[PDB]
Curated annotation (Swiss-Prot), chain A:
Native species: Escherichia coli O157:H7
Its biological purpose: DNA-dependent RNA polymerase catalyzes the transcription of DNA into RNA using the four ribonucleoside triphosphates as substrates.
Descriptive protein name: DNA-directed RNA polymerase subunit beta'
Lineage top rank: taxon: Bacteria
Subunit structure, interactors included: The RNAP catalytic core consists of 2 alpha, 1 beta, 1 beta' and 1 omega subunit. When a sigma factor is associated with the core the holoenzyme is formed, which can initiate transcription.
Part of the intact protein present: 755 to 804 of 1407
Gene name per UniProt: rpoC
Family the UniProt entry places it in: Belongs to the RNA polymerase beta' chain family.
Residues in coiled coil: none
UniProtKB/Swiss-Prot annotation, chain B:
A single GO cellular-component term on record: cytosol
HAMAP family given in the database record: NusG
Name listed for the protein in its UniProt record: Transcription termination/antitermination protein NusG
GO biological process: DNA-templated transcription termination; regulation of DNA-templated transcription elongation; transcription antitermination; transcription elongation-coupled chromatin remodeling
UniProt source species: Escherichia coli O157:H7
Claim: Chaperone is one of the keywords in the record: no
Primary role: Participates in transcription elongation, termination and antitermination. In the absence of Rho, increases the rate of transcription elongation by the RNA polymerase (RNAP), probably by partially suppressing pausing. In the presence of Rho, modulates most Rho-dependent termination events by interacting with the RNAP to render the complex more susceptible to the termination activity of Rho. May be required to overcome a kinetic limitation of Rho to function at certain terminators. Also involved in ribosomal RNA transcriptional antitermination.
Residue ranges of domain KOW in the record: 96-127
NCBIfam families tied to this protein: nusG (TIGR00922)
Superkingdom classification of source: Bacteria
Gene transcribed to yield this protein: nusG
Keyword annotations from UniProtKB, A to Z: Transcription, Transcription antitermination, Transcription regulation, Transcription termination
Family: Belongs to the NusG family.
UniProtKB/Swiss-Prot annotation, chain C:
Described function: DNA-dependent RNA polymerase catalyzes the transcription of DNA into RNA using the four ribonucleoside triphosphates as substrates.
GO molecular function, one term: ribonucleoside binding
Native source species: Escherichia coli O45:K1 (strain S88 / ExPEC)
Quaternary structure and partners: The RNAP catalytic core consists of 2 alpha, 1 beta, 1 beta' and 1 omega subunit. When a sigma factor is associated with the core the holoenzyme is formed, which can initiate transcription.
Disulphide bridges, residue numbers: none
Descriptive protein name: DNA-directed RNA polymerase subunit beta
Family matches, as CDD domains: RNA_pol_B_RPB2
Curated annotation (Swiss-Prot), chain D:
Domain of life according to the entry: Bacteria
Residues that bind Mg(2+): D340, D342, D344
Subunit relationships: The RNAP catalytic core consists of 2 alpha, 1 beta, 1 beta' and 1 omega subunit. When a sigma factor is associated with the core the holoenzyme is formed, which can initiate transcription.
Its job: DNA-dependent RNA polymerase catalyzes the transcription of DNA into RNA using the four ribonucleoside triphosphates as substrates.
Name under which the protein is recorded: DNA-directed RNA polymerase subunit beta'
Family stated for the protein in its record: Belongs to the RNA polymerase beta' chain family.
Signal peptide: none
UniProt source species: Escherichia coli O157:H7
Length: 50, 147, 1319, 483
């Protein structure tokens, strides 16, 4: 989007500032979780060529 | 719904296809969806009707349907819940030719007619109906109930 | 302000005042089921919608009707507390008014006779409690509400990489409620297609060909026409200034005596006006256009009688000669311009081989049902019968509401059956999007997602149990001519009871509740799971949908989303989410009538919301009605931007509208991260109920509504004064109202104690209010487990420091002091069912021991005389729970049996074995045992003993009910008869004594109806006689490895606990309880942890002061003023409540309960700033730094820097040491292969997997692989010949063959391939 | 293998339905016909059949694969298949000559008859490998592996009895279809629709799904699983213990290491035999503990996480005596596995025999493995409380109490530990006794006074001879602690 956030995790903040962070946090959590499968395949795959 | 078609071991599977054989002869649509061959017991998917029962009566005679009653399969409550309802209805007055409902031993969940009424021995030789036939067994005045 | 609050009040903080309504919380369940189980006087959703639509049913051509009106419900069989204890399903009977109708032979609309009403018991159906739970087999199980792709017309994108060849797709999704699916589609050859029920691609022409439109009838109804004219032996055109846009000029077009457009160029805005202004209707056109262009209609030779071009056929000049010479005035063609009106349909009608309905009809079923052959009338039936039917197909309400929203129409309702004009426009508007114009639809908008709750799920489950019997009913109605009773025998209780139990028994929906907290309990009732019946699978899901989309706003919470394989799929609703009239999501917004923010609120749907200006929460307001901020932050079109004041139509009302209950109980989300907030709310559900609860002293504000609307704690319905408080039961006089028929009010509460849940825990309700105090309507009387004075405790209050300690906190681990365990704080009972079944024979029933034989040297004194273990016993080792004794044997009947009947001086024969026992390792104490023996065969001494005590209680309670109810009525009469002051006087005493004797029957008949209940309720299932469970409880203690975490998100394991002495000391000499690491705090992110702790100190620092006033025995006026002003000021806030009146009693008790921790209530979205913290820190004489240099309790010396100390409010979690800890040497094995077993049942297996083997091989070790996979796992006998070799110390290996791999060989052998070890 | 079961026809599946065919190769067939009888689209074939008149007749059932191989051979394709090609010359003349050489380069390993494709006898699994999964503990509901094999039995009789009692091809060929329906569900469950739809078994369970349920037959076979003397365990910390040690629990150690425990008690003469010891074991004893303090030093422990991928998983440790449930360990090795101690399961392996015991303490331990197999850098590199503490001491501190009082060597650490003088300071000169092995030959070089900070100078005497010393403490240890 055009505009960003302007305030601090230390300070008092706003309602609609936390929506956008959860939009991306959900991506980051699935990122950390689903990668255990792909690596688990890639660990095997390489050793299953060697 | 699921109705248990009782059949005879050895030709028990034969009945399960003899379903599907005779299904095509009396044919239209529906009724029989998925015929299961699990095995004296053949489980058959069916909604209740007059059709297919006439077929079973046209080609017997080893076994019929299972559940509660042969005409309409398949309930789950037999006779103990009937033995709870008899308590509100209530006699120790037993004679030859009266119905004498059993609820103790291996003859529980079953009814019968008293054959011999002994007053000296305190027993009632109650004939329990099993296997399309009768089984005469001595059961106490309490081991039974008057119907 | 109300009562009971006046014991422990919280400091009501937040930027926003306390005037707003909170809903009943578990209403979504209740207010659903109420409507589904209501006698609704209209065609309304629940039963009467499922009945008025379904049953006005007739026979097959026999004309014997069944016409329906209304239904008769019955009395409940057994009650809540007792049958949950028992183990029976919770159901009620159903009578039904059933008036039959039969028509006469050749007579219109009439009745002869209906016999009677007759009626049937319509099986058994379960219901919802006042708490809000179902019960199945004596265990609480609740269904979760759903979200899927809703009915209605929707469109999709699926761009680019779907083909992965640089191509964009466009597809349809006709979603009905019931019946088959309709999938209209597109291909790369510019054509329309159909895939009914995700089957194979077949043309959409066939559908038009099918549904009343042949070649000619298809083409007539689409749109508009190209009128060619043959006038004066030359080719002409009827031209309109609309059609020429987005094209190139091909030929010299000239008319009306003026030259306009020539060859070569393209058309501009200047050229179109010359057709509009100078008037252009009729124009002359050359031949070469018509060479390529395609005929619209069929034409025929009027002379020779031949086919002048079939429909949709290209032209030739030799034909053009014959065809124009024949005699046509009007010729018609197609448009088919690539940009505007595309060649979809026009190209399709050419591709497919056939023309008529016949083949199109013929093909569909041969494709619908492959393999089987067709007929003429099976064709005619199943089209009319598939889609043109009120019975098989129902688009119902909300479908048509959406179906008619999308297509741009006036009428939102129409035909119940699919009509001829609907699919045409459905076909068209799919092409309208395919061609180019407009923007693509999205299911991501919550406008396109429907709510069904468990009652609407019950709705979906009822009608199948209605239709399955219809077959039996209709087939019996046709063959049945005789009228010797009909609605009694022809209806059975079997298919209605069974079809309902298929879903409520065996589904992913209806499952074990995770009852370990009031939070956990409430919140399982208020969640959404997307995976289930008629929705999502493991195939489609991955990315998208799972993520938040803009339309969520304050309906669904992104916080409460459980992790695992399905992260962000299972989500929870918001605190303030509600259901529509249409059955959707809604969010409340304050009506801004021009420039006035009203108090009266109106709700709007996900589609209805977008147009109007929807604010954000955080804002300021003026005195009269106007707005404070010039440029307020708001939303409307899915994005945040700046707007004016008066254009605002709606305001956002509340702070915590967005966030969920469990998530709105965490303080300072707005200083914490969004990352760590999520794992808190998920693991906040699974927390252990302590024996002694401590509360949160940093509160929020939500706590008072949650515990009351939970149904866990004892909620007072009406208002009066408490009579007799006991531990067992609390009885309360009403005084205020009095009951309707007589005998005063009197409220009674049966308090539940030392009870069990589904997740192996303890549930104890405990009293709160004093011995004989007054009570109001809606006040807490008894706190449940892990609850205290209208506050949700869960875990406890802990002194927590934030420094390392020679790394006893290494890696987010915890120290703990011994003064934690010594104060007897986190104490919990982990309670386990240890059950036994003995009997089920066809010779002799297994006896209830009365003996138990024969093994050891001690056990006879340990166990009771009866057979079961005595009321309370410390089980340790491998003892017996209930019974043994079984009737095996069948050896002979020789002398030896007459010589065996006194060594075992019991039974008829020398036969006795076992049933089940205490498991090895598990050790605990008995509390209360319960017995369930089949009605028919006799019971033990104890089965009597329990129910005999119950029969004492049954008579004791009712006689105690008689005591005051008789006195309260008869003494009120006696006092007035004295105040006021023979044949008629005898007649009065006759009629009075008759009423006395009439009252005598009331109790006895109630007693008899109740005495019947007790013994009769001992029959669960056929073929299970003995059901005795020993209720053994294991109290687990504060041990190393137990689960500990903060509310913000600090998962951690206790390392090793140091003693009190070696734990440190403050300036005052007060040691720290728990110690955390400061190292996790910056890696992943928490500032709330910092704030809660420094406010925890601030709360308890003011708390430490207030005690001293009472510790010195000072009191009187002063104590009030210290608290008064503490509530009067906490850095400029509203909701400010001083102790205004407070003239004794209230204060005395306020202080009494509010000591050693004055609790704050800090909001979530209104997370407090540092001024509020520090002013409260100023009220309690505490450092602004929050950092005191403390002398160590260990060494003695002070630290160089000043250590931050706080109170974290650490809590306990479920998966403790024993659950994860397993270790087993040798013993038992699995049934397939000679390997050990799975886990948490028999052998301590614990798998290795492919990952550790690849590891193991690389570690360069041949033995430490082989030992795990040949020597000591796959081979039992390989272990047993090595059991020989290990003990002495001889060693050296010999395997042979590895056993498990013979299953490789054998399963291939049975596959029909040959494997034999040759050579 | 108990069963025989002779069907009046046959079936198989591997050879009927699989992506590279065999029956399709040996006959010259598609799979689609071997699918539907017993390339274009379906409607294209029906229209192509409609166009190319009659023709047709009709094919047959399973016998139209059985009887086909009764005039079919292997060692005899090599004089035939290329005579068709030899007609429209040439090339293939040599292709036989090469394949003739290929056959003549045997005859050790050979290709076997294509009659073995098709089963007149349908084989079944043995008794032990197919057991009833118990529902309660004695009622024995229908197994996940016999319902379909009841069907194999069901199929043979129905045909063998109606050939006796005479039945039409409408009742006979459909039984051959229904002979194929489950005999083609029995060995494979893929690519078609068959059997029960979700009641007790969720899929269907074939021999194909027993060999390939998910990803092969690793689990049962290759992996072996489970094992004797195995354990799962949780988490602590461990500072007082060494890096070449293993802080085991009380209770689990006795349960696992049983066979040697008794092996001591029996033969030495503590317990009478193997047996008077059982009663003493059943009740738990004080003496048992004392005896088992001896073995712990002699027999190590191999420990891992729930996920392991590197050669940094199976690192093993010498056990040491502890009276606490949760397992104490090193803090360095945690970085090697990669766990932040917040719920990470630590499984146990067995160090038995004498031959297997060699490979533990010699190959892959903490006592052995230090430097990286992959990188040239250290893996033994700290995180959090280690790293920090060192800088927290080794810093150019602001003033402190001291200014600058000069000290010799042994006197240093203490004066700064003692009083007034802090530990950090910055700037104190020292007689540091350093050693530098120049020109190859032990500890050469002499003492020096060099500038450092003071937490630095406290440490620089622990110093066992080697490194730069004081040159290196200067600046920081930022990534230099590892370096």
């Amino acid at each position: 989007i055009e505009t960003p956030i302007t305030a601090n995790f230390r300070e008092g903040l706003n309602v609609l500032q936390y929506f956008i962070s959860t939009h991306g946090a959900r991506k980051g959590l699935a990122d950390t979780a689903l990668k255990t499968a792909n690596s688990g395949y890639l660990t095997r795959r390489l050793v299953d060529v060697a | 719904r699921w109705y248990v078609v009782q059949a005879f071991s050895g030709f028990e599977g034969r009945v399960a296809t003899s379903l599907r054989e005779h299904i095509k002869l009396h044919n239209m649509e529906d009724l029989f969806g998925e015929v299961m061959v699990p095995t004296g017991y053949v489980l058959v998917q069916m909604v209740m009707n007059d059709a297919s029962w006439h077929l079973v009566r046209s080609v017997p005679r080893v076994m019929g349907f299972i559940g509660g009653t042969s005409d309409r399969p398949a309930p789950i409550s037999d006779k103990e819940v009937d033995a709870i309802m008899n308590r509100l209805q209530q006699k120790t007055l037993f004679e030859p030719g009266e119905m004498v409902r059993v609820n103790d031993g291996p003859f529980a969940d079953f009814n019968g007619v008293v054959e011999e009424v002994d007053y000296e021995k305190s027993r009632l030789k109650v004939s329990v109906s099993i296997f399309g036939r009768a089984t005469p067994v001595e059961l106490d005045f309490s081991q039974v109930e008057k119907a | 302000y109300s009562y009971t609050e006046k014991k422990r009040i919280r400091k009501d903080f937040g930027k926003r005042p306390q005037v707003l309504d909170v809903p009943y919380l578990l209403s979504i369940q209740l207010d659903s089921f109420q409507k589904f189980i209501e006698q609704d006087p209209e065609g309304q959703y629940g039963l009467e919608a499922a009945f008025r639509s379904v049953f006005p049913i007739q026979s097959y051509s026999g004309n014997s009707e069944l016409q329906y009106v209304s239904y008769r419900l019955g009395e409940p069989v057994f009650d809540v507390q007792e049958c949950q204890i028992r183990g029976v399903t919770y159901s009620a009977p159903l009578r039904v008014k059933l008036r039959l109708v039969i028509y006469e032979r050749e007579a219109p609309e009439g009745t002869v006779k209906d016999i009677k009403e007759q009626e049937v018991y319509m099986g058994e159906i379960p219901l919802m409690t006042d708490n809000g739970t179902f019960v199945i087999n004596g265990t609480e199980r609740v269904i979760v509400s759903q979200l899927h792709r809703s009915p209605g017309v929707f469109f999709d994108s699926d761009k680019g990489k779907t083909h992965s060849s640089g191509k964009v797709l466009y597809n349809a999704r006709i979603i009905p409620y019931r019946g088959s699916w309709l999938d209209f589609e597109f291909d790369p050859k510019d054509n329309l297609f159909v895939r009914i029920d995700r089957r194979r691609k077949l043309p959409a022409t066939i559908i038009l060909r099918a549904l009343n439109y042949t070649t000619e009838q298809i083409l007539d109804l689409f749109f508009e026409k190209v009128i060619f004219e043959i006038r004066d032996n030359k080719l002409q055109m009827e031209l309109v200034p609309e059609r020429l846009r987005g094209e190139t000029a091909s030929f010299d077009i000239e008319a009306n005596g003026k030259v306009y457009v020539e060859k070569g160029r393209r058309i501009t805005a200047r050229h179109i006006r010359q057709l509009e202004k100078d008037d252009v209707k009729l124009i002359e056109v050359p031949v070469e256009y018509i060479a390529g262009k395609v005929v619209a209609k069929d034409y025929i030779d009027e002379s020779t009688g031949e086919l002048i071009c079939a429909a949709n056929m290209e032209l030739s000049l030799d034909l053009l000669a014959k065809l124009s010479q024949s005699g046509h005035k009007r010729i018609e063609t197609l448009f088919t311009n690539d940009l505007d009106h595309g060649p979809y349909i026009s190209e399709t009608l050419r591709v497919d081989p056939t023309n008529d309905r016949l083949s199109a009809l013929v093909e569909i079923y041969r494709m619908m049902r492959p393999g089987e052959p067709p007929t003429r009338e099976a064709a005619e039936s199943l089209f009319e019968n598939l889609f043109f039917s009120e019975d098989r197909y129902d688009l119902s309400a909300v479908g048509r509401m959406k179906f008619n929203r999308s297509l741009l129409r006036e009428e939102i309702e129409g035909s119940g059956i699919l009509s001829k004009d609907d699919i045409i426009d459905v076909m068209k508007k799919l092409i309208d999007i395919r061609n180019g114009k407009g923007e693509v639809d999205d299911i991501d908008h919550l406008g396109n997602r429907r709510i069904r709750s468990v009652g609407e799920m019950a709705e979906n489950q009822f009608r199948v149990g209605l239709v399955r019997v219809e077959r039996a009913v209709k087939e019996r109605l046709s063959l049945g001519d005789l009228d010797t009773l009909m609605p009694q025998d022809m209806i059975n209780a079997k298919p209605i009871s069974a079809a309902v139990k298929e879903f409520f028994g065996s589904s992913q929906l209806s499952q074990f509740m995770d009852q370990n907290n009031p939070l956990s309990e409430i919140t399982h009732k208020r969640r959404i799971s997307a995976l289930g019946p008629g929705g999502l699978t493991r195939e489609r899901a991955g990315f998208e949908v799972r993520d938040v989309h803009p339309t969520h706003y304050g309906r669904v919470c992104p916080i409460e989303t459980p992790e695992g394989p399905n992260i962000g799929l299972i989500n929870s609703l918001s605190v303030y989410a509600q259901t529509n009239e249409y059955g959707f999501l809604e969010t409340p917004y304050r009506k801004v009538t021009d420039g006035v923010v009203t108090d009266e609120i109106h709700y709007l749907s996900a589609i209805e919301e977008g147009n109007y200006v929807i604010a954000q929460a955080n804002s300021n307001l003026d005195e009269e009605g106007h707005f404070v901020e010039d440029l307020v932050t708001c939303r409307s079109k899915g994005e945040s931007s700046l707007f004016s004041r008066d254009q605002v139509d709606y305001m956002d009302v509340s702070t915590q509208q967005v966030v969920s209950v469990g998530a709105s109980l965490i303080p300072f989300l707005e200083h914490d991260d969004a990352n760590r907030a999520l794992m808190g709310a998920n693991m906040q559900r699974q927390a252990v109920p302590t024996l002694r609860a401590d509360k949160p002293l940093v509160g929020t504000g939500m706590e008072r509504a949650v515990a009351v609307d939970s149904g866990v704690t004892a909620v007072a319905k009406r208002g009066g004064v408490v009579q007799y408080v006991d531990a067992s039961r609390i009885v309360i006089k009403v005084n205020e109202d009095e009951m309707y028929p007589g005998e005063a009010g009197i409220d009674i509460y049966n308090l539940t104690k030392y009870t069990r849940s589904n997740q192996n825990t303890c549930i104890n309700q405990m009293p709160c209010v004093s011995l004989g105090e007054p009570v109001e309507r809606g006040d807490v009387l008894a706190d449940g487990p892990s609850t205290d004075l209208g506050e949700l405790a869960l875990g406890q209050n802990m002194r927590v420091a934030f420094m390392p300690w020679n790394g006893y906190n290494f890696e987010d681990s915890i120290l703990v002091s011994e003064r934690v365990v010594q104060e007897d704080r986190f104490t919990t009972i982990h309670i386990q069912e240890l059950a036994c079944v003995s009997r089920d024979t066809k010779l002799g029933p297994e006896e209830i021991t009365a003996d138990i034989p024969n093994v050891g040297e001690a056990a006879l004194s340990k166990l009771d005389e009866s057979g079961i273990v005595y009321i309370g016993a410390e089980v340790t080792g491998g003892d017996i729970l209930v019974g043994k004794v079984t009737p095996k044997g069948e050896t002979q009947l020789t002398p030896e049996e007459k010589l065996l009947r006194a060594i075992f001086g019991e039974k008829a024969s020398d036969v006795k074995d076992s049933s089940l026992r205490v498991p090895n390792g598990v050790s605990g104490t008995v509390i209360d045992v319960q017995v369930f023996t089949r009605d028919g065969v006799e019971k033990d001494k104890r089965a009597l003993e329990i129910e005999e005590m119950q029969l004492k209680q049954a008579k004791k309670d009712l006689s105690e009910e008689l005591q005051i109810l008789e006195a309260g009525l008869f003494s009120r009469i006696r006092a007035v008869l004295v105040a006021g002051g023979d044949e008629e006087k005898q007649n009065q005493l006759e009629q009075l004594a008759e009423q006395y004797d009439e009252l005598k029957h009331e109790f006895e008949k109630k007693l008899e109806a109740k005495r019947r209940k007790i013994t009769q309720g001992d029959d669960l299932a056929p073929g299970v006689l003995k059901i005795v469970k020993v209720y053994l409880a294991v109290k687990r203690r504060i041990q190393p490895g137990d689960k500990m975490a903060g509310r913000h998100g600090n998962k951690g394991v206790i390392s090793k606990i140091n003693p009190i002495e070696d734990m440190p000391y403050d300036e005052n000499g007060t040691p720290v309880d728990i110690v955390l690491n400061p190292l996790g705090v910056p890696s992943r992110m928490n500032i709330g942890q910092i704030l809660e702790t420094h406010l925890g100190m601030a709360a308890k620092g003011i708390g430490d002061k207030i005690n001293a006033m009472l510790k010195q025995q000072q009191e009187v006026a002063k104590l009030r003023e210290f608290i008064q002003r503490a509530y009067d000021l906490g850095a400029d806030v509203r909701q400010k409540v001083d102790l205004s009146t407070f003239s004794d009693e209230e204060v005395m008790r306020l202080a009494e309960n509010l000591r050693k921790g004055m609790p704050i209530a800090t909001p979530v979205f209104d997370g407090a700033k540092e001024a509020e913290i520090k002013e409260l820190l100023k009220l309690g004489d505490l450092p602004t730094s929050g950092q005191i240099r403390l002398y160590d309790g260990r060494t003695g010396e002070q630290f160089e820097r000043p250590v931050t100390v706080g109170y974290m409010y650490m809590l306990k979690l479920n998966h403790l040491v024993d659950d994860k800890m397993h270790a087993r040497s040798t013993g038992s094995y699995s049934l397939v292969t000679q390997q050990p077993l799975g886990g948490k049942a028999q052998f301590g297996g614990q798998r290795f997997g492919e990952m550790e083997v690849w590891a193991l091989e690389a570690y360069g070790a041949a033995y430490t692989l082989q030992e795990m996979l040949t020597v000591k796992s796959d081979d039992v006998n390989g272990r047993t010949k090595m059991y020989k070799n290990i003990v002495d110390g001889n060693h050296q290996m010999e395997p042979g063959m590895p056993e498990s791999f013979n299953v490789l060989l054998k399963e291939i052998r049975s596959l029909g391939i040959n494997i034999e070890l040759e050579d | 293998m108990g069963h025989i079961e002779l069907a009046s026809p046959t079936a198989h599946i591997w050879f009927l339905k699989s992506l590279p065919s065999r029956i399709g190769l040996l006959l010259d067939m598609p799979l689609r016909d071997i699918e539907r009888v017993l390339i274009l689209t379906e409607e294209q074939y029906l229209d192509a059949l409609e166009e190319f008149g009659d023709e047709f007749d009709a094919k047959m059932g399973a016998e139209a694969i059985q009887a086909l191989l009764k005039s079919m051979d292997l060692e005899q394709e090599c004089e035939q298949l290329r005579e068709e090609l030899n007609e429209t010359n040439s090339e293939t003349k040599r292709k036989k000559l090469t394949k003739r050489i290929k056959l003549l380069e045997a005859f050790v390993q050979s290709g076997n008859k294509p009659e073995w494709m098709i089963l007149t006898v349908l084989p079944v699994l043995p008794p032990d490998l197919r057991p009833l999964v118990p529902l309660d503990g004695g009622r024995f509901a229908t197994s996940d592996l016999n319902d379909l094999y009841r069907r194999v039995i069901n199929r043979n009789n129905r045909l063998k009895r109606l050939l006796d009692l005479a039945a039409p091809d409408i009742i006979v060929r459909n039984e051959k279809r229904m002979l194929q329906e489950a005999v083609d569900a029995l060995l494979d469950n893929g690519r078609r629709g068959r059997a029960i739809t979700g009641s007790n078994k969720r899929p269907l369970k074939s021999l194909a799904d027993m060999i390939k349920g998910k990803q092969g037959r690793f689990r049962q076979n290759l992996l072996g699983k489970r094992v004797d003397y195995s354990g799962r365990s949780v988490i602590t910390v461990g500072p007082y213990l060494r890096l070449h040690q293993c802080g085991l629990p009380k209770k689990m150690a006795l349960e696992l290491f049983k066979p040697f425990i008794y092996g001591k008690l029996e033969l030495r003469g503590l317990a009478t035999t193997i047996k008077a010891a059982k009663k003493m074991v059943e009740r738990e004893e004080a003496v048992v503990w004392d005896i088992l303090d001896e073995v712990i030093r002699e027999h190590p422990v191999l420990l891992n996480r729930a996920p392991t991928l590197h050669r940094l998983g199976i690192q093993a440790f010498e056990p040491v005596l502890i009276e606490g449930k949760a397992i104490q360990l090193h803090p360095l090795v945690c970085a090697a596995y990669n766990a932040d101690f917040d719920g990470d399961q630590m499984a146990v392996h067995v160090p038995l025999t004498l031959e297997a015991q060699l490979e533990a303490r010699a190959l892959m331990m903490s006592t052995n493995n230090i430097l990286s197999p992959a990188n040239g850098e250290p893996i033994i590199v700290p995180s959090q409380d280690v790293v920090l503490g060192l800088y927290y001491m080794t810093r150019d501190c602001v003033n402190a109490k001291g200014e600058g009082m000069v000290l010799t060597g042994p006197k240093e650490a203490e004066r700064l530990y003692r009083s007034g003088l802090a530990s950090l300071h910055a700037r104190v000169k020292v007689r540091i006794t350093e050693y530098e092995k120049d020109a190859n030959g032990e500890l050469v070089a002499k003492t020096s006074l060099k500038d450092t900070t003071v937490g630095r100078a406290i440490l620089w005497m622990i110093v066992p001879k080697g490194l730069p010393y004081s040159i290196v403490n200067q600046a920081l240890g930022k990534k230099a602690i590892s370096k």
